[PDB]
Write a protein that binds this DNA or RNA. Sequence first.
RNA 1: UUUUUUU
RNA 2: UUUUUUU
Lengths: 172, 172
Amino acid sequence: LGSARRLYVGNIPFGITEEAMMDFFNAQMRLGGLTQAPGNPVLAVQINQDKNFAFLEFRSVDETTQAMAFDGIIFQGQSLKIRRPHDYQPLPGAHKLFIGGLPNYLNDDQVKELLTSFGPLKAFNLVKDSATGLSKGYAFCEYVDINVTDQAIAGLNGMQLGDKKLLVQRAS
Amino acid sequence: LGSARRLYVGNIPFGITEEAMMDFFNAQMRLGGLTQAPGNPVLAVQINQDKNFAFLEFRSVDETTQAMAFDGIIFQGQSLKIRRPHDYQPLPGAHKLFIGGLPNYLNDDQVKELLTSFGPLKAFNLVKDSATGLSKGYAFCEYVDINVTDQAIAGLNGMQLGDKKLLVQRAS
RNA sequence: UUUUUUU
RNA sequence: UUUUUUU
């Protein structure tokens, strides 16, 4: 959703205004060259004064990520604790893998079986030609435990299938 | 409210303009290095000429406080009397205390009882884990008579509770 | 109660 | 479970 665009920042200075918070972060983002396009990343920032925390709202997912390098930064005597929201979890194509070099003959279930070995998948799609309808020789997938991704890359990449050499790498 | 952002300045020079007042204070704030962020602290200043006083409006709570060191400053032959507004009183988390090292077993009423001893509280919260729901081992509170704060720190800090050493200090 | 306390 | 995780 939009949780990949918000950040929790705790241990905020007492009585700091929401605007002062915004100005500080947009400025840090600019001074570091961390923005992806022209204009300010931080759109808004809501403060829960008693609970001593604020949430930063960003315009983009990547900039939300980039700002995390500011964890611990000193601002008005307080060292800021920047964290992702609790409802947060990586977006659907976050660790999606590209698997090419597949023999044209294998079908979904067959291809999936070769991947499933390293663990259960959360998403998968084998590209088939519009008219023809058979495999185009490559597919995309993604495991549930996003940590098994690298283990799967190592094990599957380069593997010999038919007269083809498999190619596995993150699709992004 | 916004009373932690205004200041009463009495004994102002006769016929002084509101703008001259503003320029004088923003300049003092800059010459002393008393500002927290770029830009002028003093946003506005209203003068009640007959009553011989003006109020300064600041952009931040801390800068409002910082300017008070200018009490008695000579300006156009008159020694300025800087004071907080009368409606003023410290903001909700002003003297909030952090209390850590609490045994996970104690509950709100139990924890509160250990604090209440030094006087009545105006605010209190014991942090409990989102799912689990039990104490995370630390709480925040604040007494009504904000003077008992130090007396409570001395008495409670370091106290032995279970197999833990209590830690009490202002939460800011 | 020896310089005036307001949105 | 030693600084408080929300649209």
